[PDB]
Amino acid sequence: PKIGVYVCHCGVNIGGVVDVEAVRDYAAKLPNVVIAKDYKYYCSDPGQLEIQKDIKELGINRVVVAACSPRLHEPTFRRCVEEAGLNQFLFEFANIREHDSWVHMDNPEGATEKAKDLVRMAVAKARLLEPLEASKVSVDDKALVIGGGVAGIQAALDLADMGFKTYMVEKRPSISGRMGQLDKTFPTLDCSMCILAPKMVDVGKHDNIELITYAEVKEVDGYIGNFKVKIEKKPRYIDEELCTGCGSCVEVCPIEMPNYFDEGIGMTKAVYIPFPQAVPLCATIDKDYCIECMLCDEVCERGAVKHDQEPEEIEIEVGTIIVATGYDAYDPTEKLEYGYGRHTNVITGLELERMINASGPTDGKVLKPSDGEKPKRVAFIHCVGSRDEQIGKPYCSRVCCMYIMKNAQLIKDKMPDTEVTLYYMDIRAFGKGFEEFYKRSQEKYGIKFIRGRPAEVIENPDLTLTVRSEDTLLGKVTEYDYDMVVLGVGLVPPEGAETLRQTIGLSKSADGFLMEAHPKLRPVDTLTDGVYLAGVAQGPKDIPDAVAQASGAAARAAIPMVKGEVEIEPIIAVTDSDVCGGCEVCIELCPFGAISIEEGHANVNVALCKGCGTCVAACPSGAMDQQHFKTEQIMAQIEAALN
Amino acid sequence: PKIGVYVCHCGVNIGGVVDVEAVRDYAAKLPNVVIAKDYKYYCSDPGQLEIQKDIKELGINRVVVAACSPRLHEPTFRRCVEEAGLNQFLFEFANIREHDSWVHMDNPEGATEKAKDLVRMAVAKARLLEPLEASKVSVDDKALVIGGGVAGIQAALDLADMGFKTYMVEKRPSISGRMGQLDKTFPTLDCSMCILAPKMVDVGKHDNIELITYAEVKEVDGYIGNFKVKIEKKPRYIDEELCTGCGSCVEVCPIEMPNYFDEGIGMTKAVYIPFPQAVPLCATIDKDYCIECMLCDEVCERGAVKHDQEPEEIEIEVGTIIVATGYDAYDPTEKLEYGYGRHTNVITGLELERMINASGPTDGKVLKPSDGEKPKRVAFIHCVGSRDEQIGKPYCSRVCCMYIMKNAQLIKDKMPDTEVTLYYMDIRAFGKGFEEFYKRSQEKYGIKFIRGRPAEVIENPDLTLTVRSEDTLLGKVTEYDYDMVVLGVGLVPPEGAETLRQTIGLSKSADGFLMEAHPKLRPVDTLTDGVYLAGVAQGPKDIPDAVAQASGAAARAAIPMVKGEVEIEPIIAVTDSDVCGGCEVCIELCPFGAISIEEGHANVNVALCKGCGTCVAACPSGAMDQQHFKTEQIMAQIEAALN
Numbered sequence A, B: 001p002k003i004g005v006y007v008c009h010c011g012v013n014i015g016g017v018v019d020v021e022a023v024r025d026y027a028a029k030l031p032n033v034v035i036a037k038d039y040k041y042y043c044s045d046p047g048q049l050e051i052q053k054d055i056k057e058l059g060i061n062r063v064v065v066a067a068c069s070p071r072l073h074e075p076t077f078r079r080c081v082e083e084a085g086l087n088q089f090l091f092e093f094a095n096i097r098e099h100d101s102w103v104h105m106d107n108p109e110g111a112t113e114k115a116k117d118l119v120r121m122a123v124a125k126a127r128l129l130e131p132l133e134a135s136k137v138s139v140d141d142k143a144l145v146i147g148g149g150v151a152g153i154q155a156a157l158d159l160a161d162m163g164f165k166t167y168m169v170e171k172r173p174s175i176s177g178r179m180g181q182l183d184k185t186f187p188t189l190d191c192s193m194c195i196l197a198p199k200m201v202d203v204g205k206h207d208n209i210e211l212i213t214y215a216e217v218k219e220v221d222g223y224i225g226n227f228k229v230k231i232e233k234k235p236r237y238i239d240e241e242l243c244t245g246c247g248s249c250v251e252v253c254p255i256e257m258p259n260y261f262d263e264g265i266g267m268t269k270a271v272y273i274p275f276p277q278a279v280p281l282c283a284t285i286d287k288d289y290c291i292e293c294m295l296c297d298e299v300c301e302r303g304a305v306k307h308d309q310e311p312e313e314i315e316i317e318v319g320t321i322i323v324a325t326g327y328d329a330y331d332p333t334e335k336l337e338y339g340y341g342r343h344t345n346v347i348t349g350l351e352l353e354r355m356i357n358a359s360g361p362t363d364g365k366v367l368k369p370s371d372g373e374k375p376k377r378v379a380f381i382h383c384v385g386s387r388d389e390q391i392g393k394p395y396c397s398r399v400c401c402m403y404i405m406k407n408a409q410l411i412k413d414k415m416p417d418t419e420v421t422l423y424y425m426d427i428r429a430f431g432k433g434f435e436e437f438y439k440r441s442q443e444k445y446g447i448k449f450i451r452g453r454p455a456e457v458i459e460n461p462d463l464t465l466t467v468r469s470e471d472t473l474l475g476k477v478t479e480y481d482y483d484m485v486v487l488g489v490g491l492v493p494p495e496g497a498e499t500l501r502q503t504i505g506l507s508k509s510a511d512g513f514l515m516e517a518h519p520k521l522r523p524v525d526t527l528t529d530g531v532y533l534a535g536v537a538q539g540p541k542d543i544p545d546a547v548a549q550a551s552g553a554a555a556r557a558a559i560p561m562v563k564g565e566v567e568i569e570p571i572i573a574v575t576d577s578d579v580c581g582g583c584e585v586c587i588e589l590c591p592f593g594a595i596s597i598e599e600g601h602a603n604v605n606v607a608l609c610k611g612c613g614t615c616v617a618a619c620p621s622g623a624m625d626q627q628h629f630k631t632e633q634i635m636a637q638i639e640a641a642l643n
């Protein structure tokens, strides 16, 4: 063993506290060490060049680096040594920055002694290291996209245009997500369906996209490039291949049920098409409401009605997964002071979006729920379900300000005589053109802004609503009457989010949305390799941000599939057949079942083993041993820590 | 000619105003028309299937669609007819929605008559159409990335990992952009350099990336897949291949000049390295300050100093371009009431970022410019250079709120006894974890928030600063004294932005940043094919949004390069040699020089012609004629409009 030690100054992060001169000499004087050097920034290109030159010249076969935590830069130095010809796993890392220099600033002498001890432990471990060849595994060039909203549609189209065969699983009968439910979009007031429908048709026609709507992902197993996914397609009771979406079955159906697309304010039949631009344009029967009258069977000319349909099980093999499951609107029923669900003329922002839509339940007319007449006075309340510790929702929903202003502008254009007032804490018009939109809400449409979080909404006997709120800029309490009140509800993770998160094995952030690998530089990656996030799945945001995230997720998922191969770490259990007695107290301790028994000896499957070391710690005789974490290595480290 | 006419209801967008029954019968009765049908949504899959079935059955050779504007759905129907075997350009579009139904709502009868006339004109044009084969052109599988900030670095790394050879042009001597200048990042307060430097090294080592720093893009010519780019590499007067970045030349240099990296508050030598983590780690001589003393030549051991270096011209051929040129910080000198550049202890947010940086000019100490001592009282002013019509800056800069709160928190941690007050209009903490960060600024660090836009900053004789501002929530004027005032300057397009925009040929938005193809669904595309935007080039935003945009831009630019081919529209000039007299009054009228003279006859180059039709309109005898816009076709349309 010819150990080369490299102590990093990291500028003054280590050097400021730890004497990189004494440590270097100590390392040079330790047994088996043939060189000790220090450099200002080893992770940089000059430092890696120095390490490679030292390996080439002095013939170092073991490399020890006294630098930051291995979790940051272990792969960097592993590749550095690889490019110089040395084996990947002859390398050792000493943590003297996060564990020594940054936590013992007031004890420089103790810090230097701790650094000496840690480098001694690292060299003790490095003495007994041996080469290990890492196995390559093929990466399937297929992707799964969960969620058929704007983000999911964008991700699927980008992957399919790059040549990868993509599956798109959607739990609703049709794709579109929440963007299909909007009438217009801010800040341009353009029609959302007019621009989304072509993309939906594209997804429906793409040769590289397999669209599975009305389906859920039930099981996910495996790893990057090698995901096995079990999907459950719910029974439509309509044949997708035969149905043309004419709608005669809907015409004849006698039963009426709520339309999920209309968000509780629209009705359809037990057999329904969610909206005219649905993709696939196919009928669906909800058996909770079907009475099995067979009128739809008799009126259908394609023979597409199948009352004996069963749920179908699909198994796919993919290489990457993109979660694009969006969000649900906050339910403000728990805000008792605002009276949602109790007062007749209190509605939410999404319900208003459905109501203002020309294709919505009311044919685009904003009408009071109480009497079906246009309101003359409308109040909007910001931050409902957001920025509120009384309900455990301390985050901003990021879009409610803008869509509140947009819907106020739309109400003004449709009914210019209407009076509109917004109750806000902050106006968060941060995006491109958002501040101009905010100013236009006042200058052009005459919308009134009151800086005050309403205390209460009181329903009067005539069903009008008094908003009781302080005007904080006038510094006085106001009680103003309105014919309609619209709650600016925030965004929450969708129903069934935890089930899918556990199925895939992802973590979630403090707000309840899925967590990205790094907040700053890996916004669309997760810590699970081969799984990516796009859109509001990662947190509330508007359509362009979700689309950018979907494109980025497509690129990130394409990178490994283009590479076609990934490396498996060889830190795995190995059994000594000559020592193993076949006691088998190790097999059950493997959560992945990597250990079996062949010829009376324990045998580990590399594909199943993950390298936890539990079995090795359990083995009394020591027949089992983990590569790179052998018992002798840890024992040497323990001995060096105290001697 | 067997013309099939298809009138779209578009739901009620046309049908509501225009009688799609009378128009269909009129079309059926017109000469050469063999079928007339109407469908609720023709652009949808069922409508395209209907059109294809009609073409296959009745043998239609001309297709006319009375629907929305051609600029929206002409490619859709072109591909629809292609997939049924018909030629792409036998297709005609009548605009009866944007031009008739949506603009004559109060005259339904006049609307229907106008629709009849427009369909008659469309059929008149379609009678004389003929097939045209479109030529394919290869797409170069190479990309250029302009700008070496976080967005540009991300885009280049994503493209290079997908296998494409990428050029990265950077005007500064080193990559990093503005993220390298930050000390920490919000909302996590993690070190920005610690996470950016590995990416910079990766860019510097990638086999698929050619990094050209200290260079500018001078000329761009051509089109998607076929861009010819002329780049000018400025002379460093240091040999990049030889320089190791040791810094001895800096040690010996006698001249002192401002360091651009330190934003006007840091000094370096005439030969300088912008920062220790620079990529490439190379020296640069600024000849505005060099006195040619040759001390650097004598102290350099690599012989890397080249005082006779000249600017170099590089010509590259690429298929896609990604603009990632970032932003500049607003210069608040024009806000005379705040006294920047006049008061000693008034600084900007970016200057404070450099000052709080441990590697900055002051070694991470926040010191007053007047006396070099720590301030005891600090004020932050929000929205400086933003949301202000007095300076023509009506937009939000979107990050100043958060980095103001972050730098206040950093000042508190470094100097807990310091008092910090923020003067704000709205707190825009919209991002993930931003509202929690905002609350933590108060609960944990005790930062004071005053809702008021300061009227004035007055320098007192002792050089302290009185902020005169209304507290609007107390409703009273306040005059508070501070040792330091930090202006929360906004983001503006970088210097030289207009030159590069004109060089490429891009448009800009109202705020001055580059304009995307569609605000909602194409945030990273431009209307110039093959050119994409990433990061703050498209508008102010934070690091994760810029990184998502960079990944999306990489994916979008990869799509056409994976396809490897694009179609050229055949709407081009054609000369009748038997009629052309070689008068040549057409050649100079082509801005692209597509027309030359061979054998005494005008000859058009397809590669140069773009299809404006100017030459055809100029030709008296009619020898020149534009394909798909022939004189006979327009004359027939004129005749049908009036008869």
Ligand SMILES: Cc1cc2nc3c(=O)[nH]c(=O)nc-3n(C[C@H](O)[C@H](O)[C@H](O)COP(=O)(O)OP(=O)(O)OC[C@H]3O[C@@H](n4cnc5c(N)ncnc54)[C@H](O)[C@@H]3O)c2cc1C
Residues within 6 Å of the ligand: A146, A147, A148, A149, A150, A151, A152, A169, A170, A171, A172, A175, A176, A177, A178, A179, A182, A184, A185, A186, A215, A216, A217, A324, A325, A326, A327, A328, A329, A349, A350, A353, A399, A403, A406, A494, A496, A500, A534, A535, A536, A537, A541, A542, A543, A544, A546
């Ligand atoms: C009232 C309102 C108005 C708005 N107005 C605007 C506006 O004007 N402009 C703007 O830019 N933004 C607006 N937004 C925000 C915008 O809707 C979002 O940015 C966008 O919808 C996010 O798209 P997405 O694909 O990430 O999610 P979604 O649109 O929610 O789509 C997610 C999809 O995933 C599906 N799904 C969920 N769970 C599963 C599962 N387990 N398996 C399979 N599929 C699943 C859902 O059914 C859905 O189809 C508005 C939001 C609201 C509430």
Ligand SMILES: Cc1cc2nc3c(=O)[nH]c(=O)nc-3n(C[C@H](O)[C@H](O)[C@H](O)COP(=O)(O)OP(=O)(O)OC[C@H]3O[C@@H](n4cnc5c(N)ncnc54)[C@H](O)[C@@H]3O)c2cc1C
Residues within 6 Å of the ligand: B146, B147, B148, B149, B150, B151, B152, B169, B170, B171, B172, B175, B176, B177, B178, B179, B182, B184, B185, B186, B215, B216, B217, B324, B325, B326, B327, B328, B329, B349, B350, B353, B399, B403, B406, B494, B496, B500, B534, B535, B536, B537, B541, B542, B543, B544, B546
């Ligand atoms: C004081 C301050 C603090 C901030 N703090 C944070 C924070 O804590 N967290 C956060 O997420 N964001 C923060 N931001 C915002 C963040 O800096 C931006 O989101 C990010 O820098 C944008 O990266 P970019 O690559 O788009 O642009 P830039 O970082 O500006 O990089 C653009 C690059 O293009 C180069 N370039 C320009 N013109 C040309 C040309 N013609 N040819 C070639 N190259 C060219 C530039 O030299 C530069 O290297 C802060 C901003 C400021 C001003």
Ligand code: SF4
Residues within 6 Å of the ligand: A008, A009, A010, A011, A040, A041, A042, A043, A044, A067, A068, A069, A073, A097
């Ligand atoms: S190797 Fe680690 S400690 Fe050394 S400079 Fe790099 S990040 Fe800092």
Ligand code: SF4
Residues within 6 Å of the ligand: A238, A242, A243, A244, A245, A246, A247, A248, A249, A250, A282, A283, A299, A300, A301, A302, A303, A304, A305
């Ligand atoms: S089931 Fe039959 S009748 Fe109903 S929409 Fe489908 S094709 Fe039409």
Ligand code: SF4
Residues within 6 Å of the ligand: A249, A252, A253, A254, A255, A269, A270, A271, A285, A289, A290, A291, A292, A293, A294, A295, A296, A297
């Ligand atoms: S069988 Fe069910 S879906 Fe069909 S018409 Fe009767 S109630 Fe409606």
Ligand code: SF4
Residues within 6 Å of the ligand: A382, A383, A384, A386, A387, A395, A396, A397, A398, A399, A400, A401, A402, A426, A427, A428, A488, A490, B430
């Ligand atoms: S975006 Fe506006 S309305 Fe929505 S939570 Fe944030 S501050 Fe409240």
Ligand code: SF4
Residues within 6 Å of the ligand: A575, A579, A580, A581, A582, A583, A584, A585, A586, A587, A601, A602, A618, A619, A620, A621, A622, A623, A624
């Ligand atoms: S515990 Fe040890 S001895 Fe027993 S079967 Fe496992 S490896 Fe063999």
Ligand code: SF4
Residues within 6 Å of the ligand: A572, A573, A589, A590, A591, A592, A593, A594, A595, A604, A608, A609, A610, A611, A612, A613, A614, A615, A616, A626
């Ligand atoms: S190391 Fe862990 S995963 Fe591997 S065989 Fe032993 S118990 Fe199973």
Ligand code: SF4
Residues within 6 Å of the ligand: B008, B009, B010, B011, B040, B041, B042, B043, B044, B067, B068, B069, B073, B097
């Ligand atoms: S073809 Fe045009 S007019 Fe007809 S439905 Fe589609 S978008 Fe509307």
Ligand code: SF4
Residues within 6 Å of the ligand: B238, B242, B243, B244, B245, B246, B247, B248, B249, B250, B282, B283, B299, B300, B301, B302, B303, B304, B305
């Ligand atoms: S020019 Fe020479 S002395 Fe100066 S940094 Fe480069 S190698 Fe070192």
Ligand code: SF4
Residues within 6 Å of the ligand: B249, B252, B253, B254, B255, B269, B270, B271, B285, B289, B290, B291, B292, B293, B294, B295, B296, B297
């Ligand atoms: S020649 Fe110029 S750069 Fe070199 S030491 Fe002299 S002044 Fe400095």
Ligand code: SF4
Residues within 6 Å of the ligand: A430, B382, B383, B384, B386, B387, B395, B396, B397, B398, B399, B400, B401, B402, B426, B427, B428, B488, B490
């Ligand atoms: S982000 Fe905050 S400080 Fe910056 S312009 Fe917008 S409101 Fe003003």
Ligand code: SF4
Residues within 6 Å of the ligand: B575, B579, B580, B581, B582, B583, B584, B585, B586, B587, B601, B602, B618, B619, B620, B621, B622, B623, B624
């Ligand atoms: S203007 Fe007409 S006649 Fe004259 S050279 Fe051109 S094509 Fe020929």
Ligand code: SF4
Residues within 6 Å of the ligand: B572, B573, B589, B590, B591, B592, B593, B594, B595, B604, B608, B609, B610, B611, B612, B613, B614, B615, B616, B626
């Ligand atoms: S149509 Fe326009 S571009 Fe083409 S040759 Fe004539 S003038 Fe030139």
